[PDB]
Every structure is written in structure tokens, then in C-alpha cells.
Design a protein around this ligand. Sequence first.
Ligand SMILES: *C/C=C/c1ccc2c(c1)C(C)(C)c1cc(N(CC)CC)ccc1-2
Length: 133
Amino acid sequence: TRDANGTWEMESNENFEGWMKALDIDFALRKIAVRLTLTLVIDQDGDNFKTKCTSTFYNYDVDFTVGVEFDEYTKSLDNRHVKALVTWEGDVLVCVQKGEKENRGWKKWIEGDKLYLELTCGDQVCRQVFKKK
Ligand SMILES: *C/C=C/c1ccc2c(c1)C(C)(C)c1cc(N(CC)CC)ccc1-2
């Protein structure tokens, strides 16, 4: 479906450290990030999205409109400027972040009460699965 609204709890997280390493996140912060519980909160109204990723320590919040490029500064992650764009490819929500890192972005598949997320950077893919709370 195209409705991603909800509070989403992580169930699976494959190659998180490889994806973070591809982004040049410090080895110490990677250490901590792998241990934290991650909660993904999505507020969606039409083409307007507010996405909030929260853990004990760090937060990552982004707002966007589908189909409208936006400048992004990944202040709480790898601290880079990217030109981001989120679009629908069928019922897959696709984000491309143009900038230094090649093949950067993410894709979201919503299937019932499950959310599949694939984060890409360079040649690394992190695959995550969330269940709706
Ligand atoms: C549709 C989802 C997009 C998206 C953008 C940014 C991040 C995520 C999902 C998370 C939840 C996978 C995530 C986790 C982290 N941490 C360090 C690796 C823990 C807070 C940072 C940024 C994003």
C-alpha cells in the first residue's frame, strides 16, 4: 500500500554496520548505534511526510513532499549536504540523495503491518524490517 502512517518497531536489521561504514560514520558511534533500539514514526498526509527515527541517544527527523527536491543536511548522521528527492515507483517509496556518496538513498515497501526498508550507499545495502506498533 501507499499508506506508511504509523509507529514502526524494528524486527530485523541486516548489514547496518556495513552501510554506516560506507557513510564514514565513526567506528565508535557505529559501536553504539548497533545496540540501540530504533523506532520509526511516520506521519503521512497526501504527498507530505514527516519521518522521525528515534533511539536513546540520537534522532533523525526529516520532512519532505513527494516529487519536490529538497536540500538535506544529514547533521545527525554523516553530516553531508545532499539534494534529495522522494518519489513513488508503483507502491515503492524511493529516495535518491544526490551528492558525494554514489547510489545513496533508500526504498520503502509497505506490506500490511510490515515495513521493509533498504538503505543504500555505495556498494552497501542495509535491509531492515519493521512491524507496526
Ligand atoms: C523511510 C526511512 C528512511 C530513513 C532515513 C534516515 C534513517 C533511517 C530511515 C533509520 C531509522 C534506519 C536511521 C538510523 C540512524 N541511527 C544510526 C545508524 C540510529 C539513530 C540514523 C539515521 C536513520
